[PDB]
Design a protein around this ligand. Structure first.
Ligand SMILES: [Cl-]
Ligand SMILES: [Cl-]
Ligand SMILES: [Cl-]
Ligand SMILES: [Cl-]
Lengths: 381, 381, 381
């Protein structure tokens, strides 16, 4: 078909990439789209089975060229490119991949074979990012969420600004989106005919398990507790009682999570988020930074953590550690050793002053009622 | 058909309404009923696609007359009237509506066309309330819950007493009720044949989303967290981690809800119910009144609010504000300004004494351990 | 068929039970198994419609004999016996039961008729326990969980050690297990063809309601909040907001549960677990015993209970009662009366010292900030 060898294939990629203003995508994939039942141009959800991040640039070149080949004008100076796939695009791409078709393990190529076989018009779209800027489309928002939940990129590392304004608030029935106006328009007919769909939730975001397959040692005991865009390190457990992991939040190592992790909050390896505990996400103020809890921290049942914590910190059950809470310092000499740059000159510190320190133990003196910050005895050893 | 003009229609309504003891219903609609799999006279659920409250009295007259026309004796001195619809009732009503049949937007008339088209015996029932008293039927309980959840009537404004005794505890599978005795009777057959239905919950009440379509700016991130009979003002968000809205509870303006709103509790516009916070519903005692939180209140993560709060109150994360908790008053002069009738003569107040006041800030002194009630600095401005 | 009378039947049982080394099973039943989509020898779940505990030993003898009759070597010195049923086994058993076949109410016999009618190879397995030791199979783990959730045995009374290591972490879609590797292997095909299954959770354990039918006065308002192996006494209510009942945990009488009951924790009749409260399961240390809360205890919203409590204890909302928390004792003379062996000589006690006592009221002094242990005034009366 003119691409007969892998050498021909590589020269083709070189020709494409030497086109004027060509930029290699930083992320790309192909999404199956769910459209509005009433407004068929409204994209309600995008699903990917393969995410490419800073990889497989040849495959991206073939896809971009399929579009260029039929006259689609790609602005390589825009942050992203989204385009509906036609059958001709799939056939063009598969012909460029001719040298590989009888081989196993080429995942992007396998995906195209599948899409060709299941092709429908306006069902599939190529989605790519040229840079990390605010999303301009539902499709690019979904690619970004996937980049986070598949852990191709670290938590907080990509731009999600404006996502809420672009996404439609919809009903979700067995993880399928339905326009609210469709339900209103059909309510009499559906209820009287006993065909009213079962609505699990109404929101702009889907759940993690509608999109991501956990590692074999990762457990999520209830889907409603992990939003799409959450990032769970292998080995994490999310218990169902009073937990939550929001988008652009999660764990960077195996943790037991029984409480609530707000957006922008990161919990380090070996930490234990107790039943009904709260971890807030963003510190107050205009340059208010994100909250991180370090490694091997123990957050008690029904506690609240409103500041960044370093490693080996303990918040006792029931304690609220907020930015403005005052604490009486104990164990200053030992804490100095774990925290050599910090000035332990005084006796009372606000939560915010103590942010990020290691080996802290937040507790209440049960006789005097004083809030204390002390040494986690285990943190010295 | 003898009703040929809208004038004929209006004279018919006048004749009906001049019948002896006739009362216009205060609320009415037509429900599709779910009956027991074993006990077919047991009504397990009622679904409405249209609720009429203090409106469309002509339409109610036509329906009541359909029944009277065939000899049904309506007691207009009872608080409610419930009756199974026959095809003849639907045809009678549609014939009285003849002058309107080629016009759009007559919702009660459209509903009848649909019911005629999907008619089944014992499937549909007319349900109306003549006054606001204790429900006497499953059907009237469901009409009352709908009146609350559709916001046709305000929270706490209607009589729900006895509802629990009338409703059957059932299993619910994809929002369909199943008698527990049916599951017991069929368990061997169903499990061994691998046809055991998926049971989502066992209770007397259904969920809100099985019945109500939120406004486009209202989100409920998990159906199990909003019971049928809840009332959510447009713009409310219910997060899934540790929240709840019970029946005859909710919000009167757009609020962020991440905690638990008990029955009878009302949360005012702009308030923020923090993650895992509790709002209790009814004050203790025999004349113990319902708890209301006013506008723009901020309830901290893992707090407990056991008293009514006025506007612009703050409960810090972790604080329990109970009827018997004692608080040390600060900022008395400024609080007097926001609360001119209250007597700020003393220094220690019980929670219950402070009920309903504006601009309160409940906090703990972290050095002395004292519970404080102070000024919310933002409430002066 | 040679077993023609119930007398013949009883002599057959005598002959079987006199076989060398025969032991009567302590528990038995027949499970329908769910196997791996990829690994068909992996048992992902077992479902029973009938559990026998210390009963119906004749029926167990007939089943064991069906296997022995065809040469299966049963080790009656092992703790358990598991074996796949063949049609011949079912037909053999039904022939031994000939004298009963035209009679009603023989549940084990009815089950065999059903299994014969729905027979499939490798679908059904006989599962029995000869003693209470660590489970050796998925099948025996499931029998043990059933023994707990059906309340045939008391909470904590049976050996579940090693269960986590034997169970596979799987995806669950409408309560059906799916191997994660199957989802990975089929992800492209399933997502692009729009056939991706709805995954409710990923875990090693199923939910209670996938297996157990509550009593008519028992309510569970959300299935994800009660794990399989939980034990709920008749009349219990599990609310959905922030509750949980883990395996080998629950209630021994009717309780209102709105908080989290950890594994090994037992809550006594008439107790009320408030919204977002935590009950921990096992005391710290190597001989750290299980936590029990007695009858008519009141655990406040957002409290934490980390010690065993006797009867009529109160933990105020927001209070954390941990093993190491210190409390100032009040009402010593009255508490002595309720607790005659305890030595109320001193003024400050650690939580752990107070374990199991009756009539305790844990509260905070809101003026001094001191943690108090006092008399529950209602407990004297
Ligand atoms: Cl100081
Ligand atoms: Cl005073
Ligand atoms: Cl909680
Ligand atoms: Cl002492």
């Amino acid at each position: 078909g003119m691409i007969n060898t892998k050498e021909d294939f590589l020269l083709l990629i070189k020709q494409i990439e030497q086109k004027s203003g060509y930029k290699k995508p930083k992320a790309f994939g192909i999404a199956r789209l769910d459209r509005g039942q009433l407004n068929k141009n409204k994209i309600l959800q995008a699903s990917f089975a393969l995410i490419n991040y800073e990889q497989n640039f040849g495959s991206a070149a073939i896809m971009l060229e399929a579009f260029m080949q039929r006259g689609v004008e790609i602005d390589f100076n825009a942050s992203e490119f989204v385009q509906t796939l036609k059958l001709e695009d799939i056939d063009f791409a598969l012909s460029c991949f001719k040298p590989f078709l009888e081989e196993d393990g080429h995942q992007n190529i396998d995906l195209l074979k599948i899409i060709k076989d299941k092709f429908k018009d306006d069902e599939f779209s190529f989605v790519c990012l040229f840079e990390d800027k605010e999303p301009l489309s539902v499709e690019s928002i979904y690619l970004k969420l996937y980049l986070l939940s598949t852990k191709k990129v670290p938590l907080r590392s990509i731009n999600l600004n404006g996502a809420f304004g672009l996404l439609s608030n919809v009903a979700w029935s067995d993880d399928k989106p339905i326009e609210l106006e469709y339900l209103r328009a059909n309510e009499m007919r559906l209820k009287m005919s006993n065909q009213y769909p079962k609505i699990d939730f109404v929101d702009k975001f889907p759940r993690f398990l509608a999109h991501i397959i956990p590692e074999d040692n990762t457990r999520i005991l209830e889907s409603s507790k992990v939003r799409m865009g959450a990032s769970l390190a292998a080995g994490t457990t999310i218990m169902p009682g009073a937990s939550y992991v929001n988008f652009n939040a999660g764990t960077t190592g195996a943790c037991m999570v029984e409480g609530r992790i707000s957006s922008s909050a990161i919990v380090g390896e070996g930490s234990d988020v107790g039943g009904g505990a709260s971890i807030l996400g963003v510190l107050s103020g205009t340059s208010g930074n994100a909250i991180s809890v370090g490694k091997a921290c123990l957050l008690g049942a029904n506690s609240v953590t409103g500041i960044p914590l370093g490693d080996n910190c303990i918040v006792d059950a029931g304690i609220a550690v907020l930015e403005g809470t005052k604490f009486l310092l104990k164990d200053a000499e030992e804490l100095a050793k774990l925290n050599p740059y910090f000035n332990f000159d005084k006796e009372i510190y606000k939560g915010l002053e103590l942010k990020g320190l290691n080996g802290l133990h937040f507790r209440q003196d049960s006789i005097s009622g004083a809030m204390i910050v002390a040494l986690n005895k285990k943190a010295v050893k």
